[PDB]
C-alpha cells in the first residue's frame, strides 16, 4: 500500500513573490513551469451513505497524458508522534475512457471549481500550490493554498521529521495542518 501527507495552508495574494521565489531555488534543476487543471470532482455512492474519493480532477493540458484519480478520504488513526497520514492509492486510466465508465456506472459530480497554480520539484518530498477559481466550463478563497503532497509506502516513515524540518524552514507565511 501507500500513504498520504499534507501541509495545507494559505497565503495572501500580494505575498506570493518572495514565497514562490524562496520555494523555487531549493531543489529544482532549472526552468520552473506551471499548469492549469480541470475540475471533474465526482462522487460514487448511494448505498451506504458513505461517499468515496471520486475527485477525478485531471489537468486540461497537452493531450496524450492519461487522466487519473488518487484515493484521499477516511483519515485513519495512528501516526504516533507524526503528521497527518491516511491510506492512499493511484490508478491511471485511458484518455476520456475514465469519465465514460464513470457516467456508465451511474455516478454524480461533486464540484466544478478549478484551482490552477504552480508546481515545484522538491527532493525526497514534493510540494504544490494552487488558487481556487470559480469559473465556467471553458472559462474562490482568493488565496494561494499550498501543501506538501507526497506518496510513499509504509517503509520507515522517517519523512515526517524531514517534512517538519521543511515546515520549520518554511516559517514566515505558511505552516502545516491536518484535516478532518
Amino acid at each position: 500500500n501507500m500513504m498520504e501527507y499534507l501541509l495545507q495552508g494559505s497565503v495572501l495574494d500580494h505575498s506570493l513573490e518572495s514565497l514562490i521565489h524562496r520555494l523555487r531555488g531549493l531543489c529544482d534543476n532549472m526552468e520552473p513551469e506551471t499548469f492549469l487543471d480541470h475540475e471533474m470532482v465526482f462522487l460514487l455512492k448511494g448505498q451506504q451513505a458513505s461517499p468515496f474519493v471520486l475527485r477525478a480532477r485531471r489537468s486540461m493540458d497537452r493531450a496524450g497524458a492519461p487522466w487519473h484519480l488518487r484515493y484521499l478520504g477516511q483519515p485513519e488513526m495512528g501516526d504516533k508522534n507524526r503528521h497527518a497520514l491516511v491510506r492512499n492509492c493511484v490508478d491511471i486510466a485511458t484518455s476520456e475512457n475514465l469519465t465514460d465508465f464513470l457516467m456508465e456506472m451511474g455516478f454524480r459530480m461533486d464540484h466544478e471549481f478549478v484551482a490552477k497554480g504552480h508546481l515545484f520539484r522538491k527532493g525526497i518530498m514534493k510540494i504544490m500550490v494552487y488558487k481556487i477559481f470559480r469559473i465556467l466550463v471553458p472559462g474562490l478563497s482568493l488565496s494561494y493554498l499550498v501543501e506538501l503532497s507526497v506518496v510513499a509506502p509504509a517503509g520507515q516513515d522517517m519523512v515526517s521529521d524531514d517534512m517538519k524540518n521543511f515546515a520549520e524552514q518554511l516559517k514566515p507565511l505558511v505552516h502545516l495542518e491536518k484535516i478532518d
Binding site: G9, V11, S15, H111, S141, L145, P172, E177, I179
Partner: peptide, 24 residues
C-alpha cells in the same frame, strides 16, 4: 511591520476544500 501571513485565510480555505461545509 508588514504582515506576510493571513490567519483567517488559512482556516477558511482548509474548511472549504475538503467538502462543501459553508456553501449551502
Amino acid at each position: 511591520n508588514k504582515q506576510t501571513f493571513n490567519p483567517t485565510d488559512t482556516n477558511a480555505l482548509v474548511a472549504a476544500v475538503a467538502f462543501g461545509k459553508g456553501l449551502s
